[PDB]
Copies of this chain bind each other. A is one copy, B any other.
Amino acid sequence: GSHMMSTVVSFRADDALVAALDELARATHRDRPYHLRQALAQYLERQQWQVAAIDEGLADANAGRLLEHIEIEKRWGLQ
Residues of A participating in the B interface, judged by any CB pair closer than 8 Å: 2, 4-18, 20-21, 24, 32-33, 35-44, 46-47
Contact = CB atoms under 8 A, between A and B. Distances in A.
Contact of A47 (B10, B12, B24): B24
Majority secondary structure of chain A interface residues (helix, strand, loop or mixed): helix
Interface centre among A5, A13, A32 (most CB of B within 10 A): A13
A25 to B, nearest CB: 11
Contacts of A36: 9, 11, 13, 40
Given A40-B21, A43-B42, A6 B2 contact: no
A12 to B, nearest CB: 4
Contacts of A21: 9, 40, 44
